[PDB]
Amino acid sequence: RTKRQAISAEPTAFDIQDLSHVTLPFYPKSPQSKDLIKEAILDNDFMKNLELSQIQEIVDCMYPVEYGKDSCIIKEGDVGSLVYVMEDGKVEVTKEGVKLCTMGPGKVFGELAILYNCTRTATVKTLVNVKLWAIDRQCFQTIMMRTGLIKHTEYMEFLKSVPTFQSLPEEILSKLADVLEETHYENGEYIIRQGARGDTFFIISKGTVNVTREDSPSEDPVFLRTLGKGDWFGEKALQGEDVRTANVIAAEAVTCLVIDRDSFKHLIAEAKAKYEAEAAFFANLKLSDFNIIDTLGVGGFGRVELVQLKSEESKTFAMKILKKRHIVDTRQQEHIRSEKQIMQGAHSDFIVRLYRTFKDSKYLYMLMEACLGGELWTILRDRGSFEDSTTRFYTACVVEAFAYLHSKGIIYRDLKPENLILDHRGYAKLVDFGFAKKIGFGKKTWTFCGTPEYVAPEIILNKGHDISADYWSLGILMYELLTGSPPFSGPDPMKTYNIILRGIDMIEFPKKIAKNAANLIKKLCRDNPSERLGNLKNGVKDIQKHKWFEGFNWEGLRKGTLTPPIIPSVASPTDTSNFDSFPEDNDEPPPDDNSGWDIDF
Amino acid sequence: TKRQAISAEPTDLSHVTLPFYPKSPQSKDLIKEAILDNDFMKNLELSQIQEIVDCMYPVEYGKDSCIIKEGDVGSLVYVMEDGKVEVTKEGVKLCTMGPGKVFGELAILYNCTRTATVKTLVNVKLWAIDRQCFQTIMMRTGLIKHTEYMEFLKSVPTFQSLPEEILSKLADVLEETHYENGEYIIRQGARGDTFFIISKGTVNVTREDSPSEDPVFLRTLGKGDWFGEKALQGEDVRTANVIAAEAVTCLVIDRDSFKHLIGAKAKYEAEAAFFANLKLSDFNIIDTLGVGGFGRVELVQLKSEESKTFAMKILKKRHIVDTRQQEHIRSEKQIMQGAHSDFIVRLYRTFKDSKYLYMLMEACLGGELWTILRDRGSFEDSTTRFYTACVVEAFAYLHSKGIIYRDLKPENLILDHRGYAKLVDFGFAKKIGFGKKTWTFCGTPEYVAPEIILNKGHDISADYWSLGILMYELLTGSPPFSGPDPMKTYNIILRGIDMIEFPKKIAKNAANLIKKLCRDNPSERLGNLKNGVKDIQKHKWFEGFNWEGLRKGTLTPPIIPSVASPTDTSNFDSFPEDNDEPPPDDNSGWDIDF
Ligand SMILES: Nc1ncnc2c1ncn2[C@@H]1O[C@H](COP(=O)(O)OP(=O)(O)NP(=O)(O)O)[C@@H](O)[C@H]1O
Ligand SMILES: Nc1ncnc2c1ncn2[C@@H]1O[C@H](COP(=O)(O)OP(=O)(O)NP(=O)(O)O)[C@@H](O)[C@H]1O
Numbered sequence A: 001r002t003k004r005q006a007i008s009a010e011p012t013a014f015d016i017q018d019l020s021h022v023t024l025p026f027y028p029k030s031p032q033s034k035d036l037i038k039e040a041i042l043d044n045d046f047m048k049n050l051e052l053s054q055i056q057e058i059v060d061c062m063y064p065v066e067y068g069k070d071s072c073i074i075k076e077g078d079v080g081s082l083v084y085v086m087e088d089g090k091v092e093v094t095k096e097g098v099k100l101c102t103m104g105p106g107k108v109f110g111e112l113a114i115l116y117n118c119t120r121t122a123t124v125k126t127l128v129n130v131k132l133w134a135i136d137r138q139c140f141q142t143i144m145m146r147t148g149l150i151k152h153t154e155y156m157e158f159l160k161s162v163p164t165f166q167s168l169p170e171e172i173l174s175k176l177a178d179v180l181e182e183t184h185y186e187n188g189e190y191i192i193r194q195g196a197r198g199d200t201f202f203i204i205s206k207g208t209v210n211v212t213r214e215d216s217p218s219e220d221p222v223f224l225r226t227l228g229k230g231d232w233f234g235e236k237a238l239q240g241e242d243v244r245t246a247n248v249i250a251a252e253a254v255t256c257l258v259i260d261r262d263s264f265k266h267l268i269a270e271a272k273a274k275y276e277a278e279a280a281f282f283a284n285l286k287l288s289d290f291n292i293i294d295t296l297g298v299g300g301f302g303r304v305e306l307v308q309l310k311s312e313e314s315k316t317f318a319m320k321i322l323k324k325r326h327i328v329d330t331r332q333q334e335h336i337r338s339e340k341q342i343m344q345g346a347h348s349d350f351i352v353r354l355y356r357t358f359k360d361s362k363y364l365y366m367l368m369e370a371c372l373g374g375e376l377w378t379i380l381r382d383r384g385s386f387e388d389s390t391t392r393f394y395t396a397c398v399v400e401a402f403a404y405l406h407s408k409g410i411i412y413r414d415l416k417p418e419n420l421i422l423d424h425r426g427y428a429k430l431v432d433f434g435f436a437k438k439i440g441f442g443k444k445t446w447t448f449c450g451t452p453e454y455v456a457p458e459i460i461l462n463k464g465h466d467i468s469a470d471y472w473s474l475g476i477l478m479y480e481l482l483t484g485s486p487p488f489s490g491p492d493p494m495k496t497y498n499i500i501l502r503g504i505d506m507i508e509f510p511k512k513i514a515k516n517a518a519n520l521i522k523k524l525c526r527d528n529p530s531e532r533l534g535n536l537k538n539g540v541k542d543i544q545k546h547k548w549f550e551g552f553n554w555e556g557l558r559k560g561t562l563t564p565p566i567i568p569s570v571a572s573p574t575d576t577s578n579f580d581s582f583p584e585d586n587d588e589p590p591p592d593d594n595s596g597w598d599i600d601f
Numbered sequence B: 001t002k003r004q005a006i007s008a009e010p011t012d013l014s015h016v017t018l019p020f021y022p023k024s025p026q027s028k029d030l031i032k033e034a035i036l037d038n039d040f041m042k043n044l045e046l047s048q049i050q051e052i053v054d055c056m057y058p059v060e061y062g063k064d065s066c067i068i069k070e071g072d073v074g075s076l077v078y079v080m081e082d083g084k085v086e087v088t089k090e091g092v093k094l095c096t097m098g099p100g101k102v103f104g105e106l107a108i109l110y111n112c113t114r115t116a117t118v119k120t121l122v123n124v125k126l127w128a129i130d131r132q133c134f135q136t137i138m139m140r141t142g143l144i145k146h147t148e149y150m151e152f153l154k155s156v157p158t159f160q161s162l163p164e165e166i167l168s169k170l171a172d173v174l175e176e177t178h179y180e181n182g183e184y185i186i187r188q189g190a191r192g193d194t195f196f197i198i199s200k201g202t203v204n205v206t207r208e209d210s211p212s213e214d215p216v217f218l219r220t221l222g223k224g225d226w227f228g229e230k231a232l233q234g235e236d237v238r239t240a241n242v243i244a245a246e247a248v249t250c251l252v253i254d255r256d257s258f259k260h261l262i263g264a265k266a267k268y269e270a271e272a273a274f275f276a277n278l279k280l281s282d283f284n285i286i287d288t289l290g291v292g293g294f295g296r297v298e299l300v301q302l303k304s305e306e307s308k309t310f311a312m313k314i315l316k317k318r319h320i321v322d323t324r325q326q327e328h329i330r331s332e333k334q335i336m337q338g339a340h341s342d343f344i345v346r347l348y349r350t351f352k353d354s355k356y357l358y359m360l361m362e363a364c365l366g367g368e369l370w371t372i373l374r375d376r377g378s379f380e381d382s383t384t385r386f387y388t389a390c391v392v393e394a395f396a397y398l399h400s401k402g403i404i405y406r407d408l409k410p411e412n413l414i415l416d417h418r419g420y421a422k423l424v425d426f427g428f429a430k431k432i433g434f435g436k437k438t439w440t441f442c443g444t445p446e447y448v449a450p451e452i453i454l455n456k457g458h459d460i461s462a463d464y465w466s467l468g469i470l471m472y473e474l475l476t477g478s479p480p481f482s483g484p485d486p487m488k489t490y491n492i493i494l495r496g497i498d499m500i501e502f503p504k505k506i507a508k509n510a511a512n513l514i515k516k517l518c519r520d521n522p523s524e525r526l527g528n529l530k531n532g533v534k535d536i537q538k539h540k541w542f543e544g545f546n547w548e549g550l551r552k553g554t555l556t557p558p559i560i561p562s563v564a565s566p567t568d569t570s571n572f573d574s575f576p577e578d579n580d581e582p583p584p585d586d587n588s589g590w591d592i593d594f
């Protein structure tokens, strides 16, 4: 027993762009010589396994060679690269000296040499004048390479054309090409019959077919359609058993590529699809498709009305409307602009979606999702204070929203119950991004903004601030939700700011606040932004890890399976019962502003 | 109730020299005291307070004039130096205010409306400063201080190594501490948790080498130097005194605040460099591990460590051009050097004179698996399961990068000294596309997949065919398809695995896997389906197998080879010396990567 020798033919660097530039020589032959070669090939144990198409390129490519009476065609020890077929004559083959075979015409020999550069095991020498056919290894692999690649890519442009097959990689689709079966039918043969159960899919590669169908059990079948090279039928079968709804009869000599479901199934994001569609709907809306039907809120910078589509009254939206003269007077152009940019680009279940903006010469219009469950501040007003477990639910929704915004480098900067709205399920979402800003990581911004009771001390002190300011506000929010009032507040803003600067540890916490809640509040309202929980290595995950949030069903909240603490009554998309009544803005409309600074609204 | 949000005007360029109004020391001390008396502004830091003091400007008002009228919008904060004013609201007199008191400071946060009227009772001298100039001070000094701080850090080796967003949090926790002349910042022998960076001044570092003698001068450290590193990794015992030589400020950080904010396998960046300065003559040949169609594989040893042995495959350059196999040797080098898998022999580097190519690889002294199979006859089911598992891992690595191996057989499986099997010989390996096919007839006859024989095109699924052959040979001592010559062997292969009567030696699960690996149609072979090679690891035969222990090298191999030394070639057959005439030279240039 001795080690086995590896062998190799010449490598290949041959692709689809080379099919047109290789050359397969053609030598004309009598039909009788072509069937002699065809029979000889089909008699060889190895070559009879090639495809009849490829066999009949080989016969066309073999060339004539004649030897006299006592000539030697193969020398033992020589290297071989040719396979031969004898036409006329007879030849005797000898090894080291023994007379081995004697073989006459119509037999293939030397065929190992079309696999690789063999050493010949015997010498074959003529006896009578012989006519041979030959093809050498290089041209045989060129046939195999060219025909195989042609057939393969032909198959894959057939599959790429089927809708059931459009959706899948180039890979995988090439295993599918290798699982096709070619089936040929003669004229009048039924490929498929109405009412038959089927598991096979058909693609017509050659010929044409007639699609007949009896509308009745006992009408005779009526003509319907004709399908040709490129058409398919039976696609229903690749998802399950298909009841064929028509006969398909071969109108001529037909070849189809056939695939059944089991071989298919052995080889087992709608993002720019789903959300691109919503974008189109909102894009071809004008301001003139809405009616104002009620008022959801009144703010410092704009009124928020409930609006209804004139053409689909199921579809209502919240519309924030801002006076342009007012935005210019308060010098808030870039704050409104970032409200638009950040809210439009945010895709968070805990942030109200901004679908688009409109504009006329007096107002800017922000069209967002309506949340008819109610403003959290009015709910806190009506109830006084929220239980520990109720506050935990709403605080968690803010925390999820902050996890999304802060991960994209965005500071929110106006947390407060007036800016938390309940949807119809009772889930809280952030509105009002008028102070939100996309800042760097590790960079700081300097605008003094917020709502006094909620402003972080580093904003008051003009020291620079970042997303950690939001965690300070989160602590204020918890304290207010749990007791009904925020911890820092005075009769005028300057007094309110001065109390904030004295810090959270100078406040006597009411006994209402559970120990874990008080602990989290104090860890969120540290004076130094670098000491605040949420601004450390693990970011917001440290807040979700606190004792107070231990036990909380974070993933039930994220998956929307968590039952909210307060279920709002919303009877219809028009139901504003969960909101206060507001009087009409009966003031004179502001001056027009066609300066152009709002070109991007 | 219900609260309204407020906002100042939003707003980098260094081009803004601040205005300066000269002031008496008395007037500058009057302004500073007033600021430090105001509940809000007393919380700003003193550096900024003296920029504000230097930047506010003088204003004079006459008798009976209003400095502020209720209802106006404010943007100025004031401090009076001389005079008296009356504060009124809706005509009611609230108070009288004298010099040295800040008022109107709400207006430096945002445009507040004034809540009261301030009217002079006499001539009045005030200082005032605008919001849109207070913001500029706070921003400028704030950004200047910040970028200065982080340029102090990053110069520290203990820092530098971590993202910038982190070090800007680190800058925000450094505490400025000032020391006067002769003050000891730190003393030798003290236990400390603080790290220091000198921002102003310089210090003398003294140290007594004895308790008996006296602290000698050692060093002088100045603006930019640091000390007390070691304290940010744990308690540091100070190795010297640091005394302030002048008025000194240092930025100080203790370990607990450091750790509260914080919380790179450059070893092949290293070991790759080492292999680069080697010449093809720093080695000795010790013996020969094998002889192949291309060339001998010799064990070679580095002259300088003798601990370090390697396998070196040597190929006759024109033997390769004779066989027209240049582009296969190119892919052997490319793929084996680029492969990083514990189940594939590493190719560290290439050499070449112009007559030979030299492939320097990891030596595996456990022995050729074919020689072990030769000596033992056949492997147990569990023994074969181990070696097949290493091949499967190797194929998982190669096939996941689009590379077909194409010469699996026991002659190409080598055991290392632990007994773990690895693939050698990548002469037929090729990086082909995904879903693409290649056409070169190559392999070893008993192992060649039928789609290679028939020239139908092949891809990595051919390796799964060979894997089934391997299992069959390991389990029985001979492969399933074999005849007295090639062509007979190839014709038997074409008749398929189901025409072979399996010996009863082969367990049912193994036979099932072999037959599932050697399907004629490559799209039917286990490993070529949706889950890829993971389907093979899922088979009944591999159920119970410790795949994760194998990958971690904790699984005990079925055969532990005796290797006494890195020079021990006992586990290999002996081969005679390469005594034929040297081949001709080849400077064609196809060996560009020598
Ligand atoms: N999308 C919405 N769905 C339901 N109610 C909403 C929505 N957006 C706003 N509101 C209500 O309208 C009020 C004013 O909206 P907001 O967007 O907060 O205006 P503003 O002028 O920015 N207020 P502020 O900036 O805090 O002074 C909110 O406080 C909510 O009560
Ligand atoms: N890294 C190695 N460590 C130890 N022994 C090795 C190593 N690589 C190869 N060998 C041995 O040397 C023999 C020849 O090496 P190989 O790399 O297989 O040469 P080849 O010319 O490609 N043989 P083949 O093409 O199959 O005829 C192998 O079969 C092993 O027995």
Ligand SMILES: [Mn+2]
Pocket (backbone or CB within 6 Å): A299, A418, A419, A432, B005
């Ligand atoms: Mn608001």
Ligand SMILES: [Mn+2]
Pocket (backbone or CB within 6 Å): A299, A301, A414, A432, A433, A434, A435, B005
């Ligand atoms: Mn707002």
Ligand SMILES: [Mn+2]
Pocket (backbone or CB within 6 Å): B292, B411, B412, B424, B425
């Ligand atoms: Mn080998």
Ligand SMILES: [Mn+2]
Pocket (backbone or CB within 6 Å): A006, B292, B407, B425, B426, B427, B428
């Ligand atoms: Mn090899």
